[PDB]
Structure to design on (575 residues):
């Protein structure tokens, strides 16, 4: 009966608002006031949402989705039959919940200490070391010590997590948890499509990699850099070598052309986290998109508090499932990286607002990549010389131009293979290809194959380097960021063209383009109501993911790199 399916999705939606609101409320109260009291309330709300998932999921499974006419009710009910972890029996779910809590807490309290002196946390202490030290050994101490204290301590938990997370997946009809995750894209050709895309970025990444490799050989010496080999994983300015912009100063194409201290200028000019978020809000409203509601300004946590309260710092954006209350929680630092991350979180928020009228089961991005790309699009524009000049964090030529593209490459191209490899790895863990006997070996095999990195210190039994990246102990899928990095350029190219921009794509700045706002709004309003190629068509006028836009943005940089690498006889890649 068509009418019994309408009634059920109606009830599911009313009761999910209540129960999902209560839980997000409590997970926030925890996340911005870690107590044991806020841990008790969080744990009680877990149960309550499991018990709601089970009730509604068991009812949804009694429907034959084959016999159901209405496509919206059909899609809603098929998602509700997926209970996730709530599929697990009582004991196993208790244990699943506790392992995730344990994993994340171990990552969060891990420090690295010097004998007789100070213990450094990841944020900001070790991050600063990796960003500003130019001494092999000091980079190594932080790189190895972070792996030693965070990675190794996670390993004890990881086999039981894989077993429970695959058990939930199988009870929802998937083969393993990697299957489940990939199913969010609704794209059977996903693994092929993804690989094609990564293969089109290889000329840019190999050329950038070779050139940076030569620059590290200049600074750190011939005995430490093989000009025909992988780069050591601790010399790229970042704990995971996922972005390389902190070594902009070793790799400047045109040192002759001086570029400003964005960070010194922000401090110098009395930039606060609040001003940083107000700039993002303004950019969105320049586009004709939506302003954050007053409530967001009052309830958000835009900076680390100083009232004693302890908090989880990792930047995240929060939907409270009532169409009114949205929040960012970020221990914002006053600089450029964090201004871009503020944009990224603000794009999460914009999406929440745009799709607040859909039923909650459709309150998600058209795919996870879409969710991650929105803010980055606005930020490509923010980061232009023309725009930074107008915030008065830059002054202002071809030299300046290649310099800008290099800065961008180090944040965008560099991240391409890293974002690809995380879930390459996890997918093989979940499918049983990789066992705990070779978690670590297979990590490094992929670090080599995709990124062209090696570990400065030979790894040993008990090492578990993936546990040293947040997203692994916290069980947050990562392929979304690879997708985002591709599609964000596609979105920029389209909005730029909507906005009437002529000439090279990288000089485009879309500030105040109502046309660009429109293209994005109508896609974001769709939520998860339709298969994603529809949202792509809306934005870009075609329905494929495509590296064309990215290659085109960096084309001047590719030309330069190729002439430069050729001039030095670089041998691209690494046997
Ligand atoms: C298959 O069924 C689809 C789903 O039907 C809906 O779901 C089931 C479970 C039952 O509840 C149904 O009775 C219900 O219709 C169906 O698709 C729907 O089609 C209608 C058009 O026929 C679309 O309606 C539009 O919705 C806009 C905004 O939606 C929300 O905001 C309203 C603002 O006042 C509000 O009243 C309401 O609020 C709450 O609802 C959701 C629950 O779904 C809840 O989660 C959330 O919290 C909301 O607050 C509403 O949902 C309207 O603004 C829009 O008006 C436009 O038209 C006006 C009149 O011409 C114009 O003046 C104006 O300019 C607008 O352009 C209109 O009412 C509905 O969005 C759509 N549902 C979805 C989610 O896709 C579909 O038709 C069926 N398929 C077939 C082939 O029959
Ligand atoms: C800061 C950002 N934080 C994530 C949110 C992570 C999270 C998910 C679920 C529960 C708790 C935390 C996000 O906003 O997607 C992040 O981790 N990253 C990822 C990372 O920093 O490794 C990759 C980044 C691409 C550019 C924007 C920031 C992306
Ligand atoms: C933090 O700790 C406890 C836990 O609920 C509570 O009594 C206190 O008011 C909380 N403070 C906040 C939210 O600032
Ligand atoms: Cl690593
Ligand atoms: Cl994903
Ligand atoms: Zn994000």
């Amino acid at each position: 009966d068509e009418a019994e399916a309408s009634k059920f999705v109606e009830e599911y939606d009313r009761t999910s608002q209540v129960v999902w609101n209560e839980y997000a409320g409590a997970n926030w109260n925890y996340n911005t006031n870690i107590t044991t009291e806020t841990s008790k309330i969080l744990l009680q709300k877990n149960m309550q949402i499991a018990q709601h998932t089970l009730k509604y999921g068991t009812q949804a499974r009694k429907f034959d989705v084959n016999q159901l006419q209405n496509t919206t009710i059909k899609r809603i009910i098929k998602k509700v039959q997926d209970l996730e972890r709530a599929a697990l029996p009582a004991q196993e779910l208790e244990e699943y919940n506790k392992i995730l809590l344990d994993m994340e807490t171990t990552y969060s309290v891990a420090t690295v200490c010097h004998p007789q002196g100070s213990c450094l946390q990841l944020e900001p202490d070790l991050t600063n070391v990796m960003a500003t030290s130019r001494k092999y050994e000091d980079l190594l101490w932080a790189w190895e010590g972070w792996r030693d204290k965070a990675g190794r301590a996670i390993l004890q938990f990881y086999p039981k997590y894989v077993e429970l997370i695959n058990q939930a997946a199988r009870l929802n009809g998937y083969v393993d948890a990697g299957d489940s995750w990939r199913s969010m894209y609704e794209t059977p050709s996903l693994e092929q499509d993804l690989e094609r895309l990564f293969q089109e970025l290889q000329p840019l990444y190999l050329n950038l990699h070779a050139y940076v490799r030569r620059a590290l050989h200049r600074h750190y010496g011939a005995q430490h850099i093989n000009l025909e080999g992988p780069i050591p994983a601790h010399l790229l300015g970042n704990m995971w070598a996922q972005t390389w912009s902190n070594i902009y100063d070793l790799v400047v194409p045109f040192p002759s052309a001086p570029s400003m201290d964005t960070t010194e200028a922000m401090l110098k000019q009395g930039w606060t986290p609040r001003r940083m978020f107000k700039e993002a809000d303004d950019f969105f409203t320049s586009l004709g998109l939506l302003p954050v509601p007053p409530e967001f300004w009052q309830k958000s946590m835009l900076e680390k508090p100083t009232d004693g309260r302890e908090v989880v710092c990792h930047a995240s954006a929060w939907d409270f499932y009532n169409g009114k209350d949205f929040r960012i929680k970020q221990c914002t630092t006053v600089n450029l990286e964090d201004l871009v991350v503020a944009h990224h979180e603000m794009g999460h928020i914009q999406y929440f607002m745009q799709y607040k009228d859909l039923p909650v089961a459709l309150r998600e991005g058209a795919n996870p990549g879409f969710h991650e790309a929105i803010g980055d699009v606005l930020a490509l524009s923010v980061s232009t010389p023309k725009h930074l000049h107008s915030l008065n964090l830059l002054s202002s030529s071809d030299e300046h131009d290649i310099n800008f593209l290099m800065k961008m490459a180090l944040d965008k191209i560099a991240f391409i293979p890293f974002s690809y490899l995380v879930d390459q790895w996890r997918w093989r863990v979940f499918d049983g290809s990789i066992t705990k006997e070779n978690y670590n070996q297979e990590w490094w095999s992929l670090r080599l194959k995709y990124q062209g990195l090696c570990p400065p210190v030979p790894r040993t039994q008990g090492d578990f380097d993936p546990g040293a990246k947040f997203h692994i102990p916290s069980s947050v899928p990562y392929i979304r960021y690879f997708v985002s990095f591709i599609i964000q350029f596609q979105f920029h190219e389209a909005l730029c063209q909507a906005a009437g921009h002529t000439g090279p794509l990288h000089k485009c700045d879309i500030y105040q383009s109502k046309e660009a706002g429109q293209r994005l709004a109508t896609a974001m309003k769709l939520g998860f109501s339709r298969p994603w190629p529809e949202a792509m068509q809306l934005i870009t006028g075609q329905p494929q993911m495509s590296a064309s836009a990215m290659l085109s943005y960096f084309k001047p940089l590719l030309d330069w790199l190729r002439t430069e690498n050729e001039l030095h006889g670089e041998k691209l890649g690494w046997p």
In short: The pocket of trandolaprilat (ligand 2) is lined by residues 242, 314-316, 341, 344-345, 372, 474, 476, 481 (CB under 6 Å).
